[PDB]
Design a protein around this nucleic acid. Structure first.
Lengths: 50, 102, 109, 87
RNA sequence: UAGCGGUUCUGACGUGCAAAUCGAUCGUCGAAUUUGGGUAUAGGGGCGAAAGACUAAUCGAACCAUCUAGUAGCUGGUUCC
RNA sequence: GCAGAUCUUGGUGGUAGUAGCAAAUAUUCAAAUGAGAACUUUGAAGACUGAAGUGGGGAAAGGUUCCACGUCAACAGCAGU
RNA sequence: CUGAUAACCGCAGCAGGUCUCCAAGGUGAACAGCCUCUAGUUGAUAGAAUAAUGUAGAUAAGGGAAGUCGGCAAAAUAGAU
RNA sequence: UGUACAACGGGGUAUUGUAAGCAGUAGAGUAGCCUUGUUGUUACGAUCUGCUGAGAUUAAGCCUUUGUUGUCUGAUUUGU
């Protein structure tokens, strides 16, 4: 890294856009039971294995 | 308040390292209002943030020590820790002599 | 009831910092001047002046002078006032010889 | 020596992302995947590894074409369009 | 010296800073040197200035899955009156 | 049907508020923020790494830590604005 | 952007491990060791007392290995002419 | 509210060992000068002498003190 492919950088883009909590409106929804974001990754605790 | 960013930008603008920038505590809130390099360049000119010029390292006892070695001091057997070849080699004394004759 | 009387002193730090480790002879000189001002003036909030902090740390951690000419003031407190109504405030006084001086009451005139 | 300081030297990769199964199981030196087996003509699948088939048989992805087969069988593979009667 | 190693204190640590580190002491230091990156060699197979050593914390023989709920004259347990 | 299989899974104990949080020489005063400052920020000191650096960049590897604003339940084995 | 006693690997913000370019003044043979400048830090739970026993350093009159399996650990010598 | 107690200061005792600063036909020599000498001076000069048995430190587990400055009723608990 710092000098990369495009495939790996594309996967950094997708793992960036996934790295956000629930939107607040999903909690108030009818018959919603998604309490939080469970597939959340952080760069310290879970390396993404590309 | 918090003045990390302003010290970073001040050292980056004035050119001197972070260990030499001055952020006086009287004007502190005004320095906390300046959040750009262009505002730092206005807080530099009027005298709010100055250089803190260099700690002096006077090579003067070096000059006295050198001048005293010039007169023929500091050259006994105990001010001398490398060998007679390590200080001034045999080869260089010879190359000085034999070019002179040549 | 006023008790605002400023007094100067010599504190003999040599018989206070005796036997203290060398990386603790200046900060314990600080923690000893706060106790000294508690013992004389009586109050429990003490403010050392930063010029006194320079006067302790001239010769590093372990080169505290033997005797420091202090000027201890006692003042009243304000601004959402603390647990004491009064405090002390210890400034240095800048003398040639801290040896040979007694204690002297400073007049405010 | 063979435990943690030798783990300190572990800065490379044997494997990179396979183009067919997207997995980081394509060996760099061997130039072959190890989970699917690209670039062979097949996908590696074994009856000893019954879980690996279950992880990658049909019905786990999108079914971008099979989803519309039974339904399209269900009419008898008609071509054209329907007519309009009323309302 | 740097580097590479790891000799003794059978020192420290020994529910550790560390699944083998720390500190002194020490071997070697210009070449049968040290090291990166690429590549080659794969399990009764490799590779070995050879110790049955090393082959990803595993090695007189790797790891994974399956036959496999393998076999057991041997241990243990075996539920109310 | 259950007391026991170094039983499986989940929870909870005494120990015990003890063992400890002791390498890398080091902290101190004032002000400001703030409900609250040994730990934040600024000024004044005192020092340390001493240019085979605790300095300037990069290869590998990580992947948005980069930078700003707001913020402190959680992590930062004390605290924390 | 970090490139490492917090951005990589070691279950973790782990005194370990990992490739290199630049690299100032003095003493000194020296890119050793100590001190400084440019640069960077002041981070590594703190306060008070400071007894047992420790770990790390030290010093011991007279004798001098009588200690122990063994002068192992320490001391001595140590540069240069 | 006391020939009390403390922080200082003074004195004794002690330890080290002669301070800072000034002076000096003291000073190995070496320059610069002049009437060039029969100590000819000026300057540089580690050191030496006089002041200097000085100066420093002296209680933290030394002694004493009429000198200077201060301190001296906060909480809590208890009976056959």
């Amino acid at each position: 890294a710092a000098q990369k492919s495009f495939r790996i950088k594309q996967k950094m883009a997708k793992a960036k856009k996934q790295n956000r909590p629930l939107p607040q409106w999903i909690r108030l929804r009818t018959n919603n039971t998604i309490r939080y974001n469970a597939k959340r990754r952080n760069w310290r605790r879970t390396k993404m294995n590309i | 308040a918090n003045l990390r960013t302003q010290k970073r930008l001040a050292a980056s603008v004035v050119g001197v390292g972070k260990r030499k920038v001055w952020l006086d505590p009287n004007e502190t809130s005004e320095i906390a209002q300046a959040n750009s390099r262009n505002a730092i360049r206005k807080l530099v000119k009027n005298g709010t943030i100055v250089k803190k010029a260099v700690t002096v390292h006077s090579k003067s006892r070096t000059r006295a020590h050198a001048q005293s070695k010039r007169e023929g001091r500091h050259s006994g057997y105990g001010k001398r820790k490398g060998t007679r070849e390590a200080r001034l080699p045999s080869q260089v004394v010879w190359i000085r002599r034999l070019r002179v004759l040549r | 009831l006023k008790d605002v009387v400023t007094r100067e002193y010599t504190i003999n730090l040599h018989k206070r910092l005796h036997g203290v480790s060398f990386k603790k002879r200046a900060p314990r000189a600080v923690k000893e001047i706060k106790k000294f001002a508690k013992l004389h003036m009586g109050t429990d909030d003490v403010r050392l002046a930063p010029e006194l902090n320079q006067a302790i740390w001239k010769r590093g951690v372990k080169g505290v002078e033997y005797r420091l000419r202090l000027r201890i003031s006692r003042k009243r407190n304000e601004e959402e006032d603390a647990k004491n109504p009064l405090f002390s405030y210890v400034e240095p006084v800048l003398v040639a010889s801290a040896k040979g001086l007694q204690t002297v009451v400073v007049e405010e005139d | 020596g063979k435990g943690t300081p030798s783990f300190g030297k572990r800065h490379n990769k044997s494997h990179t992302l396979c183009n067919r199964c997207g997995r980081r199981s394509f060996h760099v030196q061997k130039k072959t995947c190890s989970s699917c087996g690209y670039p062979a003509a097949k996908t590696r699948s074994y009856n000893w590894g019954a879980k690996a088939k279950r992880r990658h048989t049909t019905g786990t992805g999108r079914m971008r074409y099979l989803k519309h087969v039974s339904r399209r069988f269900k009419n008898g593979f008609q071509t054209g369009s329907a007519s309009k009667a009323s309302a």
